[PDB]
Design an enzyme around this catalytic site. Structure first.
Site, PDB file in Angstrom:
ATOM      1  N   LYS F 154       0.824  -1.204   0.000  1.00 53.97           N
ATOM      2  CA  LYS F 154       0.000   0.000   0.000  1.00 53.97           C
ATOM      3  C   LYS F 154       0.861   1.259   0.000  1.00 53.97           C
ATOM      4  O   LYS F 154       0.621   2.190  -0.776  1.00 53.97           O
ATOM      5  CB  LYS F 154      -0.939  -0.005   1.206  1.00 53.97           C
ATOM      6  CG  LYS F 154      -1.915  -1.160   1.225  1.00 53.97           C
ATOM      7  CD  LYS F 154      -2.853  -1.053   2.409  1.00 53.97           C
ATOM      8  CE  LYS F 154      -2.086  -1.015   3.716  1.00 53.97           C
ATOM      9  NZ  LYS F 154      -1.254  -2.234   3.900  1.00 53.97           N
ATOM     10  N   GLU F 180       0.900   5.868  11.153  1.00 50.20           N
ATOM     11  CA  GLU F 180       1.885   5.057  10.452  1.00 50.20           C
ATOM     12  C   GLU F 180       3.266   5.272  11.064  1.00 50.20           C
ATOM     13  O   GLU F 180       3.422   5.954  12.078  1.00 50.20           O
ATOM     14  CB  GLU F 180       1.887   5.370   8.955  1.00 50.20           C
ATOM     15  CG  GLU F 180       0.752   4.704   8.201  1.00 50.20           C
ATOM     16  CD  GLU F 180       0.826   3.191   8.273  1.00 50.20           C
ATOM     17  OE1 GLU F 180       1.950   2.648   8.266  1.00 50.20           O
ATOM     18  OE2 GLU F 180      -0.239   2.543   8.344  1.00 50.20           O
ATOM     19  N   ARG F 181       4.270   4.662  10.443  1.00 53.17           N
ATOM     20  CA  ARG F 181       5.627   4.735  10.965  1.00 53.17           C
ATOM     21  C   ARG F 181       6.225   6.114  10.725  1.00 53.17           C
ATOM     22  O   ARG F 181       6.042   6.713   9.663  1.00 53.17           O
ATOM     23  CB  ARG F 181       6.498   3.663  10.314  1.00 53.17           C
ATOM     24  CG  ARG F 181       5.888   2.275  10.349  1.00 53.17           C
ATOM     25  CD  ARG F 181       6.711   1.293   9.543  1.00 53.17           C
ATOM     26  NE  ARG F 181       6.070  -0.013   9.468  1.00 53.17           N
ATOM     27  CZ  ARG F 181       5.204  -0.367   8.528  1.00 53.17           C
ATOM     28  NH1 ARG F 181       4.854   0.465   7.563  1.00 53.17           N
ATOM     29  NH2 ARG F 181       4.676  -1.587   8.560  1.00 53.17           N
TER      30      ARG F 181
HETATM   31  N1  LIG Z   1       6.716  -2.248  -7.224  1.00 51.39           N
HETATM   32  C1  LIG Z   1       6.398  -2.587  -5.952  1.00 51.39           C
HETATM   33  N2  LIG Z   1       5.211  -2.237  -5.415  1.00 51.39           N
HETATM   34  C2  LIG Z   1       4.882  -2.567  -4.155  1.00 51.39           C
HETATM   35  N3  LIG Z   1       5.686  -3.261  -3.331  1.00 51.39           N
HETATM   36  C3  LIG Z   1       6.906  -3.678  -3.740  1.00 51.39           C
HETATM   37  C4  LIG Z   1       7.339  -3.355  -5.106  1.00 51.39           C
HETATM   38  N4  LIG Z   1       8.569  -3.875  -5.257  1.00 51.39           N
HETATM   39  C5  LIG Z   1       8.900  -4.478  -4.089  1.00 51.39           C
HETATM   40  N5  LIG Z   1       7.910  -4.360  -3.184  1.00 51.39           N
HETATM   41  C6  LIG Z   1       7.932  -4.904  -1.803  1.00 51.39           C
HETATM   42  O1  LIG Z   1       6.645  -4.794  -1.192  1.00 51.39           O
HETATM   43  C7  LIG Z   1       6.761  -4.327   0.153  1.00 51.39           C
HETATM   44  C8  LIG Z   1       5.665  -3.310   0.433  1.00 51.39           C
HETATM   45  O2  LIG Z   1       5.932  -2.622   1.649  1.00 51.39           O
HETATM   46  P1  LIG Z   1       4.859  -1.579   2.237  1.00 51.39           P
HETATM   47  O3  LIG Z   1       4.437  -0.640   1.136  1.00 51.39           O
HETATM   48  O4  LIG Z   1       5.415  -1.017   3.522  1.00 51.39           O
HETATM   49  O5  LIG Z   1       3.604  -2.513   2.603  1.00 51.39           O
HETATM   50  P2  LIG Z   1       2.445  -1.965   3.575  1.00 51.39           P
HETATM   51  O6  LIG Z   1       2.399  -0.485   3.283  1.00 51.39           O
HETATM   52  O7  LIG Z   1       1.215  -2.722   3.138  1.00 51.39           O
HETATM   53  O8  LIG Z   1       2.935  -2.317   4.958  1.00 51.39           O
HETATM   54  C9  LIG Z   1       8.142  -3.716   0.298  1.00 51.39           C
HETATM   55  O9  LIG Z   1       8.798  -4.276   1.436  1.00 51.39           O
HETATM   56  C10 LIG Z   1       8.898  -4.090  -0.960  1.00 51.39           C
HETATM   57  O10 LIG Z   1      10.042  -4.880  -0.626  1.00 51.39           O
HETATM   58 MG   LIG Z   2       2.293   0.895   4.943  1.00 53.01          MG
END
Ligand SMILES: Nc1ncnc2c1ncn2[C@@H]1O[C@H](COP(=O)(O)OP(=O)(O)O)[C@@H](O)[C@H]1O
Ligand SMILES: [Mg+2]
Ligand SMILES: Nc1ncnc2c1ncn2[C@@H]1O[C@H](COP(=O)(O)OP(=O)(O)OP(=O)(O)O)[C@@H](O)[C@H]1O
Ligand SMILES: [Mg+2]
Lengths: 96, 465, 56, 503, 187, 468
Positions: F154, F180-181
């Protein structure tokens, strides 16, 4: 409030007519419902002692609260009303 | 005479001055166009009783005077309640004038005492071949009528009423717990067409007690007791083999759960009332065989989430003595009534109760039907020539049996033009025994379709070619 | 319909502007009107007497 | 003119004063106000606060009266005076509501002037009893081939539109509303159907989109849009179904036929749960109060088909239930399924499988059955239903249908063609004669040779051809209401000619 | 349980039960006035530095408090049933709520003798002639063999009009009249 | 009006007034605090006592401490002067750049726009992401949802959307980090500083920042969304420009409400949420709408607990969003990024009368073939892939190619995958997916369609792999 903090008991206390009724060995139902009858009095009743109601049903003194006694009715609670007189049998619930 | 002090939802609290009414007492609210009956459920103390309402609580003002009737909800009962529709409180709702009877009876009555109970199981012959053969109805028992629409449940109910009225001379009561108003009207007019209820003379056989879904939960919680009281009058003061109908028991359980929840009592497992078992027992135990007569209850059952282990269906099965299931597949096969011969079971299907001959005949019929199911699977997979001569003869006999289970109904004569038959138990047993013995193996398959006694089957066979 | 809708919209805007001025002026004017406040102290006393006569 | 009419309005308004019954707010919070006093208040009675917000006195406790607030709770302070209106909540009713968007209380929110309503009707009136009703016979044409064929709806029947989110429930309701245009603007009075769409817990943008969609289709002129959006307080969302039900009861009592669509009754149940919990009423399964089955039961039972003695009117209810992951065993879905007659089941899998609308004919049922159909539609629909049941029985072998029995392959082909026939575009309702003609062309085996993918193109072309050149046959079918033998032969000739010329 | 005489107001709460019981007890034996006087004088003997303390103190035994109050009420000439009420309050631990009980009983007896004040809140008070005119019209409103009390308030927010609450009626002819101008604003 | 604190149970503070009782939703200033502590009036408990929710830590509070009343709800510094400035829940600047000197102050609590103010028009906002622009296209001035679990992507998706849209957006933009963080907030702040979107040197910034993170008490996380949407409301109404409102994550608003509900004195609703869940969520969401005065394009990230979309908090949000994008963990585990679920994402503008017949046909064909692939996977589980017919093998191959071609590298995701970020135009996506549906590339390996932009890049990757 509490179960025995009802207006009728308070009136009995303030009027001073708390002498004629035998609160040591008999009691009056405060609230009958959900199969458990709260009894005001029975100061000398025992835990698990069987008590008989005015209608004829018998009950077991389960909860001995500071102000009332929680009696479970061994029968239909329809026959028990508020103000019914509950008297001790002087015996833990037993069976012939 | 008390005064309303709380109108929370359908729960109304009335405070009395002179005499507190006992629990399960009917309180009539004053100043309302339509009768509002309050049933005392608790004694809250300070001369206050908490009551549930049998109608809408809108327009109630704190301080309205309520009169203690002095007894539980008393309904008009008697022979004149036949052919009438009355709600829980006993008021007629068929717009045919007041129900003029001689005596009234409180809905809340104790179960018959231990000595009054009968000590001998007895089969109530319903005149239907499948029911009387494979899943007999115990006199004073409880029947779980499975199946919904499209299987002719209402036709079966009407035919049961007619058969019990004609054979045992006993009337019937239909207590619709939570019944849809549209379906209630449809059933009323269908019964009128069938003739089980007559609007002209006093030959009606059904007393209707309708608690609609739009009524408060307290009303649907006591509609079953109202119908049961109507049946109890016939059982006790007339000594008839009454037939009670509850459509359905699950809505009775749901109404009880809603009523308990409204009173602020901590629910039991799967969100049911703590008093589920006790309320169900108090309702069912009045359906028994006394020395004067008997009441037999055919209760429709809806299984929530299709889970037979749910508390409501389990508690209901705890009291059932037989089950009749109307399978849509059987109806599509063209067999009416659509009672499933295999899934339907009866507790009294024991040699000690129905006799050795009846038990042997029924067990043989069920075994032949199961073998037919296996051979039909084989025919579906392999060819019909694969099975032996014995398998072919068993298939033919089983087809003859399952077409013999079909039966014309008097209640359906006006529609299908086929005369209805009231087959006695002896004729049913003899016919099925002769069919199993291979006596009528030469007759065609259609010779046994939609007939009464086996003599009519041989007559129909003679009619064919 | 273009002209009709434009005229209707202008009418509505004029109406809302007029009511805005009226509601923002009447309150302050009557707050500054003591000579009308003293009679407004007795616009209802006779009305109160009539209402009580209706009650009685 | 504007100043003159404003002054005329203000002089017309009379500032009358009178006695009242009043009470003070002991505690206000979360839209629930505990009011001291107000001794002579009826249960479920409208009361207005000092700030101008209205309210409904639900809990008549001894010490205080618990009243729900019809607005934001910030305008209610401790000690504010709560006047008594003296009447149970009621909403404006009549023909004047047609073409207007109103809130839960009937106040106009479309900015088109006040409602010229001459009559006022309550929201908690009892449903008609057993005697006044009659068996449902007249069809309620939804314009969808699947609905009008396999799950028919009659006038006076509570049919449920149940399914997960983003499956087409609102689309089904809106095309049902649109389809009734052909009857309303016509001449036959006993066929006109006045639609009433109640929006519960939906953003104002969605309601505006729906209103624009109706206005573009010229369907607003016989439609009432009762709006209780998510911004509105929970009591308004609770009352909106009852307000719409009363607005439909007005048409029902006067011999007219009304259609009421409670969109997202689950959101109304959520609002009622919020009100009950904030009123400290004891909770139950899924925190819903014990009288939550009562809430929907006393609402849907008001949908009925009155007999001729009472006018002959009707009120058809189309509740919408938003199941979660297709779980129909949940509390509110089970309640609504038990209350209503049948349901129209929509599935996401079928929606993305190309079967749009996503009506799952296996699970969708109609307890009123074929009694709510025209003779021609019933005649074609019995055969179509039987054939589709046979196909769904053998649908498992479609993956390996090449090496199957000839009968099984025939059933698969017929079922695939019927399923392709059941597909229909959005906002394109079909007349009953057009549907019966298409279903006739399908069930009679005029599509077996045709490619399954070409059914839709063939269906559209055949509809255009029959509407253009063979309008007389369609009119005769519509007027007669049955596909007679002569019409059967004419249809046979027409479908044979068009099938021959299709290539 | 013998039936008890319900007070007219029927106030609710923890003090409500005690006040209702006291009203029922004093209605019997016809000692309402004496009990009311003893209550209005017992509040003053419940606010001394020694008396107010040691009863809000939770670490002194109730027995001590009961006696401390029994001897106090005995030497305070109190020998009817009000002493019993004080003893009951001490035993049940509702001593801190005793002023509330006194206020509730006083309101009950006031409604038994006087009437709900006709609160008027318009602006700074007008001439005394208008005051007595409004008092007379309020008396005419009551006109039930009773005499009502009056409470005049001042509200700058309220415009030239006045709001009167004669009992529980609360008529309103005030700044809300200018609020009712929204009808012109609406349509 | 001065009141005293009588109860400090948890984050809920009870204040008793004597003279003037503040109305509900009023900001209360706690005197004697070294910092600024703000209490929001939530309930009127009676007896001239109000129950309040603290916007900061309650440590150090003592019963009897004086509390003032602002006379109005929480007012934030709003205007064009808040661009490039991070601000707290109560409006205080937390970027150490001094006070936010502005001429306007707006209360974070306000009425939702009326029905007559709703705008029915809806264009299509091309974002450059293949799945989004193909199956669930975004609408200009429309509410956008980013449903997803923990780790599905997300935050990365919303960062890519900010990169693609905010820079190209003529109007202003607002980011409201809710619960969030703080590490993510610092990363976004530095990225927008180095990307020119936020310029510290001169007043040419285009993005405002409102940050209440998970270290804040539940009272703070239940109001930062209101602050951000209030800044967006000012940029929409007072100024006629278009507004972009990025919220991440909006679920924390509901979670904060649930956290405070138990102490507020409410019977818990289902799954332990507050009984007023839908009411407060709707009150917040209806304010984020496109009116006739202006348009707010909201891209809200929605956390789905335990990847259970039937949970009430994400379930209620579906009715509040026009276009929804559901990121699924199963797709992410396959390596397909973004993890958008093709068979779960929905858009209101997905309609032939809006996006054209060709776009609708391509999207519906893609969804249908993916559904058929889902159906055939069960058969492949038992029968075996080699045992399938020749006809459905082609369908499975096309479905694999479509699944891989839905994947797309992101500029914000260069640090992880290493691939160059791509931004495929809408017509290129439509043509590529139509060609894949037609089978024009059945001769290319499925690996060639993984993490590529336009179909030309796919054929280039195919021939490059063939060269080796
Ligand atoms: N193009 C991409 N789009 C989304 N996520 C990706 C992509 N490439 C790699 N990722 C991996 O997906 C994970 C998404 O992390 P994050 O956005 O923090 O998830 P959330 O926000 O749901 O916690 C990342 O750790 C990353 O390593
Ligand atoms: Mg997130
Ligand atoms: N017959 C149809 N053919 C094609 N698309 C359709 C059809 N019916 C509906 N849709 C589309 O499906 C989507 C969902 O439709 P709709 O809003 O009616 O569903 P819903 O389940 O009632 O919605 P929600 O749960 O969000 O209230 C819309 O994009 C709509 O255009
Ligand atoms: Mg919808």
């Amino acid at each position: 409030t509490t179960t025995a903090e009802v207006s009728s008991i308070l009136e009995e206390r303030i009027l001073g007519a708390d002498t004629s009724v035998d609160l040591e060995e008999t009691g009056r139902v405060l609230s009958i419902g959900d199969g458990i009858a709260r009894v005001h009095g029975l100061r000398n009743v025992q835990a698990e002692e069987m008590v008989e109601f005015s209608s004829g049903l018998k009950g077991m003194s389960l909860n001995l609260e500071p102000d009332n006694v929680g009696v479970v009715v061994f029968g239909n609670d329809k026959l028990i009303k508020e103000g019914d007189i509950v008297k001790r049998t002087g015996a833990i619930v037993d069976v012939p | 005479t008390g005064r309303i002090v709380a109108v929370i939802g359908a729960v109304v609290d009335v405070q009395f001055d002179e005499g507190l009414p006992p629990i399960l007492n009917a309180l009539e609210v004053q100043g309302r166009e339509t009768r509002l009956v309050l049933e005392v459920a608790q004694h809250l103390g300070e001369s206050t009783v908490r009551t549930i309402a049998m109608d809408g609580t809108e327009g109630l003002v704190r301080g309205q005077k309520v009169l203690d009737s002095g007894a539980p909800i008393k309904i008009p009962v008697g022979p004149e309640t036949l052919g009438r529709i009355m709600n829980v409180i006993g008021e007629p709702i068929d717009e045919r004038g007041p129900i003029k009877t001689k005596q009234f009876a409180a809905i809340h009555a104790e179960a018959p005492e231990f000595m009054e109970m009968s000590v001998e199981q007895e089969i109530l012959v319903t005149g239907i071949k499948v029911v009387d053969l494979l899943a007999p109805y115990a006199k004073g028992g409880k029947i779980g009528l499975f199946g919904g629409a499209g299987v002719g449940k209402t036709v079966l109910i009407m035919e049961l009423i007619n058969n019990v009225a004609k054979a045992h001379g006993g009337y019937s009561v239909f207590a619709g717990v939570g019944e849809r108003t549209r379906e209630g009207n449809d059933l009323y007019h269908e019964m009128i067409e069938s003739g089980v209820i007559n609007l002209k003379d006093a030959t009606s056989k059904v007393a209707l007690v309708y608690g609609q879904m739009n009524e408060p939960p307290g009303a649907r919680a006591r509609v079953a007791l109202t119908g049961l009281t109507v049946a109890e009058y016939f059982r006790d003061q007339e000594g008839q083999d009454v037939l009670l109908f509850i459509d359905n028991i699950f809505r009775f359980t749901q109404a009880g759960s809603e009523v308990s929840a409204l009173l602020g009592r901590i629910p039991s497992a799967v969100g049911y009332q703590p008093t589920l078992a006790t309320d169900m027992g108090t309702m069912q135990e009045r359906i028994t065989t006394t020395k004067k007569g008997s009441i037999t209850s055919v209760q429709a059952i809806y299984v929530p989430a299709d889970d037979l282990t749910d508390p409501a269906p389990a508690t209901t099965f705890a009291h059932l003595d037989a089950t009749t299931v109307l399978s849509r597949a059987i109806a599509e096969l063209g067999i009416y009534p659509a009672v499933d011969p295999l899934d339907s079971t009866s507790r009294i299907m024991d040699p000690n109760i129905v006799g050795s001959e009846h038990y042997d005949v029924a067990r043989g019929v069920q075994k032949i039907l199961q073998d037919y199911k296996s051979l039909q699977d084989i025919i579906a997979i392999l060819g019909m020539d694969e099975l032996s001569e014995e398998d072919k003869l068993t298939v033919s006999r089983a087809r003859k049996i399952q077409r013999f289970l079909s039966q014309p109904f008097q209640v359906a004569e006006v529609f299908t033009g086929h005369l209805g038959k009231l087959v006695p138990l002896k004729e049913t047993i003899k016919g099925f025994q002769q069919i199993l013995a291979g006596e009528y193996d030469h007759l065609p398959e259609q010779a046994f379709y939609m007939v009464g006694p086996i003599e009519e089957a041989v007559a129909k066979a003679d009619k064919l070619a | 319909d273009y002209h009709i809708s434009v005229q209707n919209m202008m009418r509505q805007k004029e109406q809302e502007h007029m009511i805005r001025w009226v509601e923002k002026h009447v309150v302050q004017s009557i707050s500054a009107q003591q000579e009308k406040e003293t009679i407004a102290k007795c616009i209802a006393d006779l009305k109160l007497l009539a209402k009580k006569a209706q009650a009685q | 003119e504007v100043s003159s009419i404003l002054e005329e309005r203000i002089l017309g308004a009379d500032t009358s004063v009178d006695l009242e019954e009043t009470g003070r707010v002991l505690s206000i919070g979360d839209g629930i106000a505990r009011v001291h006093g107000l001794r002579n208040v009826q249960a479920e009675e409208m009361v207005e606060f000092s700030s101008g917000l209205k309210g409904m006195s639900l809990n008549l406790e001894p010490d205080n009266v618990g009243v729900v607030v019809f607005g934001n709770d910030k305008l209610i302070k401790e000690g504010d005076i709560v006047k008594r209106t003296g009447a149970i909540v009621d909403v404006p009713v009549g023909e004047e509501l047609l073409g207007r968007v109103v809130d839960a209380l009937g106040n106009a929110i479309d900015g088109k002037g006040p409602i010229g309503s001459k009559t006022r009707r309550r929201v908690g009136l009892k449903a008609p009893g057993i005697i006044p009703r009659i068996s449902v016979r007249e069809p309620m044409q939804t314009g969808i081939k699947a609905v009008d064929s396999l799950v028919p709806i009659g006038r006076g029947q509570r049919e449920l539109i149940i399914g997960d989110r983003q499956t087409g429930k609102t689309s089904i309701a809106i095309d049902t509303i649109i389809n009734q245009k052909r009857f309303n603007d016509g001449t036959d009075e006993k066929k006109k159907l006045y639609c009433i769409y109640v929006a519960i817990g939906q953003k104002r943008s969605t309601v505006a989109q729906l209103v624009k969609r109706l206005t573009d289709a010229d369907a607003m002129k016989y439609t009432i849009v009762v709006s209780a959006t998510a911004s509105d307080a929970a009591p308004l969302q609770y009352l909106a179904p009852y307000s719409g039900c009363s607005m439909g009861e007005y048409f029902r009592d006067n011999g007219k036929h009304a259609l009421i669509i409670y969109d997202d009754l689950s959101k109304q149940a959520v609002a009622y749960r919020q009100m009950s919990l904030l009123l400290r009423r004891p909770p139950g399964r899924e925190a819903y109060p014990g009288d939550v089955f009562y809430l929907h039961s006393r609402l849907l039972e008001r949908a009925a088909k009155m007999n001729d003695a009472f006018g002959g009117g009707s009120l058809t209810a189309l509740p919408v239930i938003e199941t979660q992951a297709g779980d129909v065993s949940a509390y509110i879905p089970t309640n609504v399924i038990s209350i209503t007659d049948g349901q129209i089941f929509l599935e996401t899998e079928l929606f993305y499988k190309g079967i749009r609308p996503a009506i799952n004919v296996g699970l969708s049922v109609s307890r009123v059955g074929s009694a709510a159909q025209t003779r021609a539609m019933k005649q074609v629909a019995g055969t179509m239903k039987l054939e589709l049941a046979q196909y769904r029985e053998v649908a498992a072998f479609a993956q390996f249908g090449s090496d199957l029995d000839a009968a099984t392959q025939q059933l698969l082909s017929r079922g695939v063609r019927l399923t392709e026939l059941l597909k229909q575009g959005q906002y394109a309702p079909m007349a009953i004669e057009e549907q019966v003609a298409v279903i006739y062309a399908g069930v009679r085996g005029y599509l077996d040779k045709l490619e399954p993918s070409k059914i839709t193109k063939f269906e559209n072309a055949f509809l255009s051809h029959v509407i253009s050149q063979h309008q007389a046959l369609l009119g005769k079918i519509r007027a007669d209401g049955k596909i007679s033998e002569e019409t059967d032969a004419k249809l046979k000739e027409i479908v044979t000619n068009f099938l021959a010329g299709f290539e | 349980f013998a039936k008890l005489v319900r007070p007219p107001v029927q106030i609710y709460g923890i003090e409500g039960r005690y006040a209702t019981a006291l009203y029922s007890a004093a209605s019997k034996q016809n000692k309402l006035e004496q009990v009311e006087k003893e209550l209005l004088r017992v509040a003053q003997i419940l606010k001394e530095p020694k008396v107010a303390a040691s009863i809000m103190n939770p670490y002194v035994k109730r027995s001590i408090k009961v006696k401390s109050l029994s001897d106090m009420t005995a030497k305070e000439k109190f020998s009817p049933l009000t002493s019993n009420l004080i003893n009951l309050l001490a035993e049940n631990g509702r001593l801190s709520s005793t002023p509330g009980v006194i206020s509730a009983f006083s309101t009950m007896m006031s409604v038994h003798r006087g009437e709900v004040p006709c609160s008027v809140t318009t602006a700074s008070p007008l001439d005394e002639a208008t005051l007595t005119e409004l008092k007379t019209v309020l008396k005419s409103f009551l006109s039930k063999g009773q005499i009502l009390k009056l409470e005049v308030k001042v509200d700058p927010s309220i415009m030239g009009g006045m709001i009167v609450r004669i009992g529980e009626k609360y008529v309103d002819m005030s700044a809300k009249t200018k609020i009712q101008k929204l009808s012109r604003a609406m349509r």
